[PDB]
Amino acid sequence: TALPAFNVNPNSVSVSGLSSGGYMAAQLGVAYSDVFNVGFGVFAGGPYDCARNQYYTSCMYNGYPSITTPTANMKSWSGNQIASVANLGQRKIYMWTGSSDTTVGPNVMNQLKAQLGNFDNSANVSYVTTTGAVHTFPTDFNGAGDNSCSLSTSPYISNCNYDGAGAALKWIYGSLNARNTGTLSGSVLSFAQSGSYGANGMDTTGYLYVPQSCASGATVCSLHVALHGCLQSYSSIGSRFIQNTGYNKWADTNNMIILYPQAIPDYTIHAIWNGGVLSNPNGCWDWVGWYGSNADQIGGVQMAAIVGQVKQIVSGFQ
Numbered sequence: 001t002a003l004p005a006f007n008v009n010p011n012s013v014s015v016s017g018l019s020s021g022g023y024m025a026a027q028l029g030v031a032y033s034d035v036f037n038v039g040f041g042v043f044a045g046g047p048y049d050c051a052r053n054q055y056y057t058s059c060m061y062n063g064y065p066s067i068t069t070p071t072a073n074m075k076s077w078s079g080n081q082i083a084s085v086a087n088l089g090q091r092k093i094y095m096w097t098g099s100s101d102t103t104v105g106p107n108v109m110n111q112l113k114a115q116l117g118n119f120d121n122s123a124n125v126s127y128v129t130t131t132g133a134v135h136t137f138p139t140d141f142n143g144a145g146d147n148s149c150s151l152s153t154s155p156y157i158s159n160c161n162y163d164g165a166g167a168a169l170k171w172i173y174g175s176l177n178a179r180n181t182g183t184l185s186g187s188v189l190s191f192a193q194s195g196s197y198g199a200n201g202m203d204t205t206g207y208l209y210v211p212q213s214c215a216s217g218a219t220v221c222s223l224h225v226a227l228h229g230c231l232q233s234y235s236s237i238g239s240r241f242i243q244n245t246g247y248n249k250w251a252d253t254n255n256m257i258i259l260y261p262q263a264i265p266d267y268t269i270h271a272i273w274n275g276g277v278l279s280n281p282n283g284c285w286d287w288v289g290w291y292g293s294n295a296d297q298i299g300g301v302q303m304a305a306i307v308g309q310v311k312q313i314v315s316g317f318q
């Protein structure tokens with residue numbers, strides 16, 4: 001099915017994600033700060049350009065990645081390979097980690113905090129820590145199939161007694177109507193991630209949750225892009241990220257569409273920025289350069305595809 005155009009204001013776009021989806025949220029937020037012009041959210045991700053000049057495992061497992069060059073590159077690329085970093089001073093940025101995350105980790109997120117500290121006033125950056133939470137998406141309900149917030153295992157979505165989706169949306173957008181406490185009003189559309197909407201490393205189908213208010217075209221909506229993490233693509237866990245992460249109940253009472261782009265497991269070995277070659281068996285978003293030297297720059301194929309999806313959705317603005 002073709003990705004529809006909706007009555008969404010192009011000035012109301014943001015993105016967030018977990019894991020490699022968190023990394024990608026920041027890559028989009030930085031490289032395309034003009035497109036994601038409200039802000040972005042990072043759950044258990046890491047520094048922009050973290051893995052370009054140091055090996056990816058140094059950007060994981062609660063290690064201490066360097067941000068010297070990554071920060072320098074942001075300064076250097078501003079206005080060319082990425083949108084003006086001045087934009088970032090005018091963005092709401094949400095950050096979250098579990099204190100017991102040993103997959104990415106507080107130390108990694110601390111480095112992202114420091115990096116962004118060079119481009120956005122602390123007042124606009126919220127960095128929340130849930131004590132005891134492991135690498136997992138934090139929600140405050142028992143989604144079907146959820147793993148314990150104390151055990152990092154598939155589907156990496158938990159009841160951590162913390163509404164992470166709500167927190168991120170409220171930090172990015174400000175005051176929101178109370179989340180829907182009943183059945184959702186909308187549907188979960190599928191669309192073809194093909195042509196300009198698709199790319200290497202991406203599934204051929206994406207999804208989006210569309211509240212009844214946004215479907216009719218009679219109401220101007222906003223757009224939030226939510227990016228699953230590694231081992232969280234549709235191929236791995238089906239619709240569990242779409243359904244169990246808690247974005248939809250907020251979208252539903254706040255005239256918001258939630259777009260859910262899908263990556264896919266990729267067992268082909270590719271040259272990456274640093275450390276030689278690597279396949280992408282876990283279906284992560286590209287934060288290491290699997291599909292291009294420009295993965296976190298304007299033109300990066302996955303970012304270009306997601307931005308394409310965004311432009312299509314907002315093309316229906318009335």
Ligand SMILES: *[C@@H]1O[C@H](CO)[C@@H](O[C@@H]2O[C@H](CO)[C@@H](O[C@@H]3O[C@H](CO[C@H]4O[C@H](CO)[C@@H](O)[C@H](O)[C@@H]4O)[C@@H](O)[C@H](O[C@H]4O[C@H](CO)[C@@H](O)[C@H](O)[C@@H]4O)[C@@H]3O)[C@H](O)[C@H]2NC(C)=O)[C@H](O)[C@H]1NC(C)=O
Binds near residue numbers: 123
């Ligand atoms: C990211 O975080 C930063 C830091 O908190 C935010 O930036 C501040 O934003 C507020 C509100 O927009 C600014 O407040 C305005 O300050 C003006 C004076 O600015 C002078 O001084 C600052 C340094 O203190 C210089 O940077 C600036 O160039 C000026 O020299 C006031 O004149 C404003 O008041 C007038 O406008 C308001 C609104 O219309 C009216 O209500 C008033 O009556 C009056 O007419 C206002 O108080 C503040 O200056 C900003 N500080 C910074 C960092 O420069 C970002 O907004 C935030 N990102 C976002 C947008 O979310």
